[PDB]
């Protein structure tokens, strides 16, 4: 049966919630003497709708805070449904919330039970009201293979936003970004960083003309329109852009494959450059320096790293193999 209740809210609605966004919100307990209780609301009921607000797809934290926020004395309309069987499963298997987020700020654990994260990490949040304590989300760190690694406590959206704001003071990125696994329907653009990135592109554009292509820098600016045409011909666009341009490309949902060619040493770059492009007059010391600064400050943007060996051009084979290996991977994308 499906039941509809109307009552005035006292100091509280006299309720305790279980479940969450994955399985629905559930009455885990009523209070013996309460307007809600007398209205017929009982343990095991799934709260389908409160006032006009949909409750079938709401995180438990949102549900708790919504019902809290309701004004003392005013009226409340609850649509509910008895689900003793579904509720039994939810309690016994202890499931409630389930969704994935991608972080966009650095966080150091504040308790031994907490998870630290860099920018760009993905988490499955499984409990948004961890231990019945507002503020803590229970999350499982998702690895490169998309399997679940370890679990632990991270801050909730609200505190995360606060922490992410104190950190900043171009990306419009929220502290947590809702993400889901998707397959690429297009050959996504390639950007290569590293002391021989310029050489990498030229060899890729040359030896593999039908798989790759270079997006031209017009009077320097590379615009989106040039990239779109390379995609529409079924090729990867090779992009000589900035870290910040990569960030903007991720936000705009183009999620480029980003390869970093990690140099072995300053003197190693010189030897590689002398072999691969003696014609170039670019400084190896400056290229190496920029490479270190880049890795130091923007490693969260990399999707793969290849460790250069200065006496060995096996990086090119590795690069082609890596670029494809990536394309075949699924991507965490916005909602």
């Amino acid at each position: 049966s499906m039941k509809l209740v109307k009552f005035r809210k006292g100091d509280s609605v006299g309720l305790r919630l279980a479940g969450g966004n994955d399985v629905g919100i559930f009455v885990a307990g009523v209070l013996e003497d309460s307007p809600a209780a007398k209205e017929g609301l009982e343990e095991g009921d799934q709260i389908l709708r409160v006032n006009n607000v949909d409750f079938t797809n709401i995180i438990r934290e949102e549900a708790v805070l919504f019902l809290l926020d309701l004004p003392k004395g005013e009226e409340v309309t609850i649509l509910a449904q008895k689900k003793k069987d579904v509720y039994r499963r939810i309690v016994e298997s202890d499931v409630g919330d389930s969704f994935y987020i991608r972080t966009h700020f650095e966080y150091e654990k504040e308790s031994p039970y907490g998870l630290s994260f860099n920018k760009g990490e993905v988490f499955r949040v499984v409990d948004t009201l961890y231990n019945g304590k507002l503020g803590s989300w229970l999350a499982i760190r998702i690895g490169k293979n998309h399997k679940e690694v370890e679990r632990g406590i991270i801050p909730n959206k609200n505190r995360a936003e606060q922490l992410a704001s104190v950190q900043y003071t171009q990306t419009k990125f929220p502290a947590y970004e809702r993400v889901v696994l998707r397959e690429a329907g297009f050959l996504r653009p390639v950007t290569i960083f590293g002391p021989i990135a310029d050489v990498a592109r030229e060899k890729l554009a040359r030896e593999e003309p039908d798989i790759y292509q270079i997006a031209k820098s017009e009077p320097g600016i590379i615009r989106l329109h040039t990239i779109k045409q390379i995609i529409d011909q079924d090729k990867h666009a090779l992009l000589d852009v900035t870290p910040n341009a990569v960030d903007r490309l991720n936000y705009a949902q183009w999620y480029p494959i980003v390869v970093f060619l990690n140099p072995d040493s300053k003197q190693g770059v010189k030897t590689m450059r002398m072999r691969l492009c003696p014609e170039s007059r670019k400084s190896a010391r400056k290229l190496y320096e920029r490479s270190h600064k880049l890795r130091k400050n923007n490693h969260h943007l990399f999707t793969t790293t290849i460790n250069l060996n200065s006496m060995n051009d096996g990086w090119y084979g590795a690069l082609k193999e890596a670029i494809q290996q990536q394309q075949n991977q699924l991507v965490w994308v916005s909602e």
Binding site: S12, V13, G14, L15, R16, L17, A28, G29, L31, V64, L67, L68, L129, N131, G132, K133, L134
Partner: peptide, 7 residues
């Protein structure tokens, strides 16, 4: 025995 949150 987690600390319940009643609203």
């Amino acid at each position: 025995g987690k600390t319940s949150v009643w609203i």
